[PDB]
Design a protein around this nucleic acid. Structure first.
Ligand SMILES: [Mg+2]
Ligand SMILES: [Mg+2]
Ligand SMILES: [Mg+2]
Ligand SMILES: [Mg+2]
Ligand SMILES: [Mg+2]
Ligand SMILES: [Mg+2]
Lengths: 65, 402, 119
RNA sequence: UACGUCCCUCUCCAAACGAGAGAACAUGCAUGGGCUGGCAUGAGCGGGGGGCUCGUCCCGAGGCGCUGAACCUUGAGGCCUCAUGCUCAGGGACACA
RNA sequence: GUGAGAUUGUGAAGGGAUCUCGCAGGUAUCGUGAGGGAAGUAUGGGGUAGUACGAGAGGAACUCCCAUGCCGUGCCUCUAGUUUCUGGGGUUUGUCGAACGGCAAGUGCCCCGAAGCCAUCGCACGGUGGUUCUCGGCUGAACGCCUCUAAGCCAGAAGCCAAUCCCAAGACCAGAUGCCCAC
RNA sequence: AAAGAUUAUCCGUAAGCGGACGUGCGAGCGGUGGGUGUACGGUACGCUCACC
RNA sequence: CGACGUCGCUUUUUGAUCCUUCGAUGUCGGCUCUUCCUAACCUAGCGCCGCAGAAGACGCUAAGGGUUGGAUUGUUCACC
RNA sequence: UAAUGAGAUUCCCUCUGUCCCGAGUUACUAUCUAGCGAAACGACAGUCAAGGGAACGGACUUGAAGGGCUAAGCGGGGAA
RNA sequence: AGCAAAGAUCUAACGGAGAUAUACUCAACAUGCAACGUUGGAUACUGGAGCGGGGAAGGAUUUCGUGCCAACGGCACUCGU
């Protein structure tokens, strides 16, 4: 298949691993959002930015490189 | 008075008695029907369960909604070191049954074969197969070998060979047994003179799993269920649990019978042993007969997925270790926990349905971790997410300091 | 094998003393909270008892204080512990009596510590 | 008489207790290392709303840096022999009028 | 005959007779399979086909694929659930003088959480032969023709019986075997 | 269940037919011993003790 | 299909009785769970029709398997 | 008839393991040991099918089973 | 059957007959276990509507020291109303 990357943390979501999700306010480009953990979906529900969480790829590309 | 509404009864009544298995190993109670027009070949092989994982493959099924589309199927990994043949038995038909004529032995038996005869091998005299070894090459014993080989050719209709799992090539730390698992494998194909010549030729020689099965076939898996102790009626039989305000308890069967017949029946569900039962579970499609890591350092690599990786996941199969030998990979689940010996036997079902004739090509084998959530497929991918960490930058500081 | 290719000397003397870490979390996992410090004394008496081949094991209040210093359910994950084997027999016994006095070694970090014989 | 079996000891595919699978100087057990995962950046030290003192120096939640740090990781029982410790003629009972 | 015991109601060392049974098996593995159990059952779609049939209105079916409901046996890769790994952290009140480390609140509470267990809340699998009922027939008389029946045959139900499947020699297996002993 | 079921080595089929250590010293089929490579790591195959 | 008649089967109704129990057989309906029976609603084969097809009436062999979710009612029943 | 009610009833909102449909964890039991140690109950006892019988037998008639002894359950019988 | 409410005990030294109790050719584990009191130490609890300190009613020597363990204190006791 293909390796989707997570919406919150941009982890690697290899086939048969994550859990996809589609909200009522859906984007035309990303209708369905792929998540790798429940911890990724939990920080998506409380509406945290992907940056300011130190273990996501958004943080590690703006602070540490 | 009749039962007011109808449900189908709980539990298949043909798997009674639901008592513990008499032996831990899978044992075939019936081999496939002997086609004497075929070529002589073995019919079963013992493998050990080594966790499970999932794959990705595209589907050739014309008419289906998933035709030429990729599915994710769960597969179970079963490690298969080769079995060494040590004997040849032969059985003759009687109106009572099927009587054993005799057994020849191999003239050379393994330490772990004749370990099966001892409850304590290391604190023993270890002199089993020691007078048979020296009588077999006397004048009278070379006669008696050929005496009972001829008695196979006269009386036997069923020729079987005796193999054992060869556990020292299974370099596994958690399968703690050191004596070998012994079973009989039936020869099917040809006449009895053509079976014995295949039984003589592979005697004191190891037989490998890809000489018994092919890559995209099915098989039966005789195996013993994972044990769960004494369980009550809701866990064991699947009865409905009673309403919350019930006195003395919920997880019970309310009525265990009428006034008359004034006895409890065998059909009424009761509590007792759940698990550790023998099951045969036909039509387990095989997807990959693997090859040892000494031959193949790249086992899970596909044509369509060129990542150089083995079948063993990151951090090993949980509770098992590493698959160090040949392996078969079957679609779905097999009855039993990891580390348990299981018997792959050739099918008795007609293998003519179009689901079972289907040739399998894979596209992906999940080699991610089974501890936690699997995220990386190789350790090369975790060293590219994570750069040099702290423990790496002080190991690189000791390596410059020397 | 590997146990045959060992550089095995005779017995160690009757007064030997060694330091060892005992990972206590592997012995106290899902035990009831009101007895994790009572039966962590027993898991130390059994640890050094099948190690020094003794039935008399003495806890030597530095060690009793250490496994109880966080209450009955806050037993630490590890203790670095000092075994000392001795010999003292009541006059008239047909067999020789060994005892073990186990005490605390404070280390402040349990990483990189293996079993060593002291004195 | 011997082969042996069983108990005690160890392991957990088994398990209410028995029984079972095993092992019995064996990477067997113990601790450590590495892996694998979990959480989410440790103690300590150093350079922001405002507010004291006589440009400077102190009080101040928070923040930033060392720091994907610190800790935990098999244990009713994850992985690797990756290193070292520990064993020093295993002990009892039957087999045996 | 040879070994081993006992003759215990009134003191003791002796040794007569008599009675009781011991005098051959033990241990370990691979199988047999009588007998008993017993299971899978339904549905929709595709096309066949807008065809057969019919004035038109209307309107089929089998092979053959694809799925699914109910049930059954498992399983834990995924997803979901569960956490006394009180694992890591966060937070409140009290309390060790403060930080540190914690602790108390029958697991303080909140978030994430391995492993294990587990859900039609996920996943995998669920197969052969005959006998013969209804019945339709074939030859064929009784009854010089006729007739499925009287003799005899054919085909044949989700029934019934076996195969597979589960337990299995109090089904007492001179079934086979490894090693000791005893003849 | 074997076929002397009347004495006695087996093999293979009934008519046939293959050979079977010779006399304490020998030999033969053999279980375990010393040194320089072969088949799918360590077990086999080359070149002192029992039995005939 | 079948009046007038007539011969009967059934013991899931009720009446009639008073045999057993009053030094006690716990007296309804749900819920649960298993099994049985056939007078067969669905499913397997069928015959026959005032059976063209489609739906269906009647019958035969068969009880192997299946036979629900609800509103009201304490309800069996009833009723949507 | 406002206010009041551990009063009787009905609907709606929120709410949820009441349910679909169950699963998993905890403390305490059960369970195993050490010490201690009862009661209810007890004609005798205790495997069934049919027949008959005071017309629902553990014992009688004819059949069908049944080697002995145990541990944990369990609620069909003992018209317990 | 049970002796399952009222969180809970651990440690060392002494005391005590209550031990460290062994027919050989045995180094110890695998052949004397369990349980008692006191002081020290650790850990808890009650939490001032207290398992705190005094009175009535009721009891009438249960008070106190010293000995002591037959029976009693439903387990135990070297302790004891
Ligand atoms: Mg288990
Ligand atoms: Mg049968
Ligand atoms: Mg009032
Ligand atoms: Mg109790
Ligand atoms: Mg308090
Ligand atoms: Mg008492």
């Amino acid at each position: 298949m293909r390796t989707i990357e997570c919406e919150f943390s941009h982890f690697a979501v290899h086939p048969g691993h994550g859990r996809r999700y589609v909200p009522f306010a859906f984007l035309s480009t990303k209708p369905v959002l792929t998540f790798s953990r429940p911890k990724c979906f939990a920080l998506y529900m409380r509406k945290k930015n992907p940056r300011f969480i130190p273990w996501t790829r958004t943080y590690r590309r703006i602070h540490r490189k | 008075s009749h039962c007011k509404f109808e449900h189908p009864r709980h539990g298949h009544l043909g798997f009674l008695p639901r008592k513990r298995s008499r032996q831990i190993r899978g044992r075939a109670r019936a081999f496939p029907k002997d086609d004497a027009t075929q070529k002589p070949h073995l019919t079963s092989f013992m493998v050990f369960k080594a966790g499970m994982t999932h794959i990705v493959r595209d589907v050739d099924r014309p008419g289906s909604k998933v035709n030429k589309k990729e599915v994710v199927e769960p597969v179970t990994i079963l490690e298969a070191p080769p079995m060494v043949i040590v004997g040849i038995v032969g059985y003759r038909q009687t109106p009572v049954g099927l009587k054993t004529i005799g057994t020849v032995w191999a003239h050379h038996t393994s330490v772990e074969f004749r370990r099966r005869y001892y409850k304590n091998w290391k604190q023993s005299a270890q002199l089993a197969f020691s007078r048979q070894k020296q009588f077999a090459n006397t004048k009278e014993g070379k006669v008696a070998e050929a005496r009972t080989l001829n008695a196979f050719a006269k009386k036997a209709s069923v020729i079987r060979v005796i193999a054992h799992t060869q556990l020292r090539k299974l370099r596994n730390h958690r399968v703690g047994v050191k004596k070998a698992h012994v079973q009989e494998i039936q020869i099917n194909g040809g006449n009895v003179a053509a079976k014995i010549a295949l039984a003589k030729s592979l005697l004191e020689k190891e037989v490998r799993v890809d000489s018994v099965f092919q890559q995209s076939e099915a098989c039966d898996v005789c195996s013993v269920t994972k044990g769960h102790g004494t369980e009550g009626v809701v866990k064991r039989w699947g009865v409905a649990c009673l309403p919350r305000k019930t006195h003395r308890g919920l997880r019970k069967v309310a009525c265990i019978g009428a006034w008359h017949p004034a006895r409890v029946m065998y059909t009424v569900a009761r509590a007792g042993q759940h698990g550790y039962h023998h099951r045969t579970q036909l039509n387990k499609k095989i997807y990959q007969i693997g090859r040892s890591v000494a031959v193949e350092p790249n086992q899970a690599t596909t044509t369509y997925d060129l990542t150089a990786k083995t079948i063993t996941p990151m951090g090993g199969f949980v509770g098992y270790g590493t698959v160090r030998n040949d392996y078969v990979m079957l679609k779905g689940s097999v009855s039993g926990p990891r580390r348990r010996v299981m018997t792959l036997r050739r099918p008795m079902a007609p293998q003519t349905s179009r689901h079972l004739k289907e040739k399998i090509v894979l596209k992906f084998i999940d080699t991610s971790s089974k501890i936690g959530h699997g995220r990386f497929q190789t350790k090369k991918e975790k060293n590219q997410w994570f750069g040099p960490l702290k423990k790496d930058r002080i190991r690189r500081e000791e390596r410059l300091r020397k | 094998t590997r146990a045959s290719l060992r550089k095995r000397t005779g017995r160690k003397p009757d007064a030997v003393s060694m330091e060892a870490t005992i990972h206590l979390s592997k012995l106290l996992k899902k035990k009831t909270f009101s007895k994790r410090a009572p039966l962590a004394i027993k898991r130390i008496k059994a640890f050094v008892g099948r190690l020094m081949k003794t039935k008399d094991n003495r806890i030597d209040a530095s060690l009793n204080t250490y496994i109880w210093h966080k209450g009955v359910k806050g037993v630490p994950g590890r203790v670095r512990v000092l075994i000392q084997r001795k010999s003292e027999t009541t006059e008239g016994n047909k067999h020789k009596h060994f005892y073990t006095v186990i005490s605390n070694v404070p280390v402040a970090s349990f990483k990189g510590l293996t079993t060593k014989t002291v004195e």
